[PDB]
Structures are given as structure tokens and as C-alpha cells.
Amino acid sequence: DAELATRAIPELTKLLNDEDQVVVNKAAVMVHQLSKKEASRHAIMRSPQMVSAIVRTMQNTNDVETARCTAGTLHNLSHHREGLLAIFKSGGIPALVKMLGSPVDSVLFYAITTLHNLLLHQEGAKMAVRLAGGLQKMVALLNKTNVKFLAITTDCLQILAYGNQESKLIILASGGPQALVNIMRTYTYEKLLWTTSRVLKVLSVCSSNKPAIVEAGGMQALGLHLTDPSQRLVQNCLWTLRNLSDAATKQEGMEGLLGTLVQLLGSDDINVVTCAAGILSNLTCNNYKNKMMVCQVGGIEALVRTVLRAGDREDITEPAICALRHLTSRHQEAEMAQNAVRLHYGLPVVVKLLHPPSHWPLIKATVGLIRNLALCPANHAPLREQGAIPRLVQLLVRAHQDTVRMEEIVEGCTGALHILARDVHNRIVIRGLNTIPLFVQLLYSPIENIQRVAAGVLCELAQDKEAAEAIEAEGATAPLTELLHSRNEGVATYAAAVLFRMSE
Numbered sequence: 001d002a003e004l005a006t007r008a009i010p011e012l013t014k015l016l017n018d019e020d021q022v023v024v025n026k027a028a029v030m031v032h033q034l035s036k037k038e039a040s041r042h043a044i045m046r047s048p049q050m051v052s053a054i055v056r057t058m059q060n061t062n063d064v065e066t067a068r069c070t071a072g073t074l075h076n077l078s079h080h081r082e083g084l085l086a087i088f089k090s091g092g093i094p095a096l097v098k099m100l101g102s103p104v105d106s107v108l109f110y111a112i113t114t115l116h117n118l119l120l121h122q123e124g125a126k127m128a129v130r131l132a133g134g135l136q137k138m139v140a141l142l143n144k145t146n147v148k149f150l151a152i153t154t155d156c157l158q159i160l161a162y163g164n165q166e167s168k169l170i171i172l173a174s175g176g177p178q179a180l181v182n183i184m185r186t187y188t189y190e191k192l193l194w195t196t197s198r199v200l201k202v203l204s205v206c207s208s209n210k211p212a213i214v215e216a217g218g219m220q221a222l223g224l225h226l227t228d229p230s231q232r233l234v235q236n237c238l239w240t241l242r243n244l245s246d247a248a249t250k251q252e253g254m255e256g257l258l259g260t261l262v263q264l265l266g267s268d269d270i271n272v273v274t275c276a277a278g279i280l281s282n283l284t285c286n287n288y289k290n291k292m293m294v295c296q297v298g299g300i301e302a303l304v305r306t307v308l309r310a311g312d313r314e315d316i317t318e319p320a321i322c323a324l325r326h327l328t329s330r331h332q333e334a335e336m337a338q339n340a341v342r343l344h345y346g347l348p349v350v351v352k353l354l355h356p357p358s359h360w361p362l363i364k365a366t367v368g369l370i371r372n373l374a375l376c377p378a379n380h381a382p383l384r385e386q387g388a389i390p391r392l393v394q395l396l397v398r399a400h401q402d403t404v405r406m407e408e409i410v411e412g413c414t415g416a417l418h419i420l421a422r423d424v425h426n427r428i429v430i431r432g433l434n435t436i437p438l439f440v441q442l443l444y445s446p447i448e449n450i451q452r453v454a455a456g457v458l459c460e461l462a463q464d465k466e467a468a469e470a471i472e473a474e475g476a477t478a479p480l481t482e483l484l485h486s487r488n489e490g491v492a493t494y495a496a497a498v499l500f501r502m503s504e
């Protein structure tokens with residue numbers, strides 16, 4: 001069987017080396033229609049004699065029936081690791097990519113099939129096509145229409161992406177993302193969407209290029225398939241949107257995407273809820289154009305319940321607590337969003353997350369959220385009767401006695417007593433825990449924003465009579481008097497307003 005070509009092989013090599021571009025064309029066809037034999041393709045393989053001659057004849061031809069059979073051999077040889085090694089050694093890779101510069105898809109399919117098999121098999125072939133300029137062509141090859149073609153070209157761009165930060169920018173340089181997301185908002189085929197998603201997912205793991213797909217509409221197109229029945233896909237369409245969320249904060253025309261996300265917060269896979277609660281956190285950090293869209297679709301309802309699903313788990317807790325904070329500061333439906341937390345029974349599950357086993361970053365967002373919630377004074381009465389002002393004042397000491405920075409809490413944990421002191425009974429509860437020496441201690445901090453919220457909870461506290469008969473001791477009727485000269489002005493204002501309500 002195979003003992004035939006094992007000696008007839010060197011014959012066909014010589015006739016390939018000939019000059020006449022007809023005694024080499026149809027001669028190479030003889031090699032192909034023999035490669036259809038798993039017994040004798042082994043013989044073409046085992047001896048890498050013409051393995052160069054096939055490669056060499058490919059990039060030195062002008063007839064199309066040549067390349068139809070020429071590269072087809074290279075395909076029909078990728079079926080075993082034995083052959084792959086020969087194709088790399090024979091310099092085929094910086095030549096197989098030249099066939100990507102053809103319109104005849106019969107050549108292109110046979111070509112990109114080999115390049116796919118090499119990457120997901122042949123070691124040491126990544127550095128190859130990276131340098132044969134194929135990163136350009138593979139992108140520019142995303143004009144064709146044969147679903148399975150673009151489903152392979154996108155995958156060959158995945159391996160050539162997960163690795164070097166430099167291989168991506170070629171994709172960022174020539175159409176790339178704007179031609180990529182086109183494959184996501186025009187094609188029904190499922191496998192191609194998943195293959196394309198891993199590309200867009202990999203491209204989104206460095207802030208250097210994240211603001212490129214977003215301007216290309218990547219958030220919009222990726223929002224189309226969030227509901228797609230292929231669950232093995234949506235988990236890629238989500239991790240991408242979580243990384244991208246640092247760019248669409250200042251982007252418009254993206255509304256309905258949120259509406260499909262706020263719904264997913266009550267789904268089966270706890271994975272999706274986690275990434276979904278994160279997608280809404282960074283899509284809200286400083287932008288009251290998305291916020292109002294989240295509220296009028298029941299965002300607060302969807303989040304309090306989601307905060308209540310887990311509780312002890314913190315992968316869910318942070319991006320939802322840190323979300324509700326964004327939906328409770330500087331926007332139109334502010335007061336309503338501060339109300340809606342209470343009506344939907346939020347106050348408990350919020351103050352509960354102050355207590356352990358919760359760790360520091362969640363406690364940051366929670367403390368900031370309680371400052372936010374206290375703006376509608378209806379929220380004061382429960383927080384007082386919820387066991388909150390204590391665990392605030394202790395957390396402050398936990399972050400104080402040793403002075404993310406604990407000082408970032410000392411500010412927010414005091415600045416939440418300032419929006420809490422605007423209620424009458426809470427000023428007694430603060431006064432009751434015998435804390436006035438600590439707020440006075442804070443003023444001496446020569447930092448900055450800590451100066452403000454310190455005097456803030458004192459300025460609110462001193463409106464009553466007995467605070468003058470208390471803060472005037474301990475050592476305040478002088479350090480504030482040597483603070484009015486502060487460069488910061490809201491810091492000076494507060495540092496003075498205390499000094500007033502003390503004389504009479």
C-alpha cells in the first residue's frame with residue numbers, strides 16, 4: 001500500500017521544481033488526489049521532502065486550479081500531529097497567510113482551516129502568524145458571508161489575542177472592533193456569536209483599548225444576545241460588559257440594555273446575577289442619564305431583593321450595595337430612590353451588612369449608602385431603631401486607633417453621622433455613646449476632607465443647648481478657632497459654626 005509513494009515521492013518533487021507553469025499545476029493535483037489516502041498521506045507526511053515544494057509552489061503561482069489543490073493538501077495533512085510539524089518547518093506559515101490575500105473562498109477555507117489547526121495544536125506557531133502579518137488579513141477577511149468562515153476566522157483571532165498585549169492593537173488598528181460587533185448584530189448563527197464573543201472578551205482586559213468597542217457600539221450589540229438561549233454564550237457576553245463598564249459611563253443610546261440587565265438579577269445562575277450586579281455598578285458611576293432609566297424599570301426593587309438573596313456572599317453584595325449608592329446621589333429621582341429603598345424593606349438588610357463577617361470594601365459602599373439614605377429624613381427613624389449609629393461609631397474607632405485606607409472610612413463613617421445628625425433623637429444617641437472627645441480629636445487631622453465631616457457632625461450637634469455645655473470642654477474652644485484660617489472654605493465654615501453655638 002504505502003510502499004508505493006514511499007519511493008514515488010521524490011519523483012513528484014522534481015516535476016514540481018520544473019519551470020513550465022502547467023507541468024507544475026496539474027502535477028501538484030496528483031499530490032492532492034493522493035493525499036485523500038490516510039495510508040499514503042502518511043508517506044507524503046513521513047518524508048518532508050516536497051513539504052517545502054508544495055509550500056513553495058503555492059506562493060509562486062498565478063493559476064487558480066493550482067491553489068485549489070495546493071493548499072488542500074496542507075488541509076488534508078493537518079489531521080495528525082505528525083504532519084503539522086512539517087508544515088511549520090517548511091516555512092509554510094509565512095506563505096499560507098499569503099493565500100488569505102485571495103477572493104476565491106475555495107482557497108481561503110482550505111487556508112484558514114490549516115491556520116486554525118496549527119494554533120490549537122502546533123506548539124510554537126503563535127509567534128509565526130503573528131509575524132506573517134496575518135493579524136491584519138484575518139481581520140480584513142471579515143467581509144465574507146459563509147457563516148462558518150467567519151466562525152473560524154474569529155477563533156483564530158482568539159488565540160492570537162490571549163497572550164501578547166501587542167497582538168491586539170493590530171485588531172484595534174484595521175477595522176477590528178467596529179467590523180467585529182458587526183458580526184454580533186447581523187448574524188443568527190449561534191456558534192459564531194460565541195466564537196466572536198471570546199474575541200471581544202479578550203480585547204476587553206486592558207483599559208488601553210476598552211474605549212474602542214464602546215464607541216463602536218459594542219455595548220449595544222452585546223446587549224442584543226443577553227437573552228439568547230445559548231447559556232454557554234451569555235456568560236461571555238457578560239464578563240465582557242463588566243470590564244467595558246468603565247467606558248460607557250459617558251455614553252448615550254444604551255437604555256434598553258439596562259432593562260434587560262435589571263431583569264436578570266433574579267435568574268437561576270448565581271454567576272449571571274453577580275456580573276449583572278456589577279454591570280449596573282460601573283454603568284452608573286457619575287451619570288444621571290442611565291440612573292433614571294434604572295429606577296423607572298424597578299431597579300431598587302430588583303437590587304434590594306438581590307442584596308437579600310445572598311447576604312453572606314460578597315461577590316453579589318458589593319456591586320449591588322455599591323450600585324444602590326449610585327442610584328442615591330445627584331440625580332432627578334433622588335428622593336424617590338431614597339424612599340423606594342425603605343418601602344421595599346431595605347433598611348434592615350443594609351445595616352445588617354455593617355456587621356461581620358462582611359469585609360472592608362463592602363463596608364465602604366454600605367457606609368456611603370447609609371449617608372445617602374439619610375437624605376430623606378423618613379429614613380432616619382428606622383436607622384435609629386435599627387441598631388446603626390452604634391456600629392457606625394465603633395467602625396470609626398476600628399479605622400481610627402491605627403492612624404483600602406481606613407481613613408477613607410473615617411471620612412465616610414463620620415460624614416454619615418452628619419446626614420444622620422439632622423434628626424433630633426439621633427443626636428442624643430450619638431451623645432449617649434460618649435463620643436465628643438473623638439470628633440474633637442478628628443479636627444486635629446491635618447489631612448483634608450476629614451476636617452469637614454468632623455465639624456459637620458459637631459455643627460449639627462451644637463444646635464442643642466447641652467452640646468455647648470459639653471464640647472466647650474474636652475478641648476475645642478481653641479483648635480477650631482485655629483482652623484478657620486483653613487485653605488478649604490467649607491472646612492472653615494463648619495469649623496466656625498461650631499464656635500458660635502457655645503458662647504450663648
Ligand SMILES: O=S(=O)(Nc1cccc(-c2ccccn2)c1)c1ccc(Br)cc1
Nearest residue numbers: 245246281282285322361364365404408
Ligand atoms: O470603593 S471605591 O469604589 N474603590 C474602587 C476600587 C476599584 C475600582 C474603582 C472604580 C473603578 C472604575 C470606576 C469607579 N471606581 C473603585 C472608591 C470610591 C471613591 C473613592 Br474617593 C475611593 C475609592
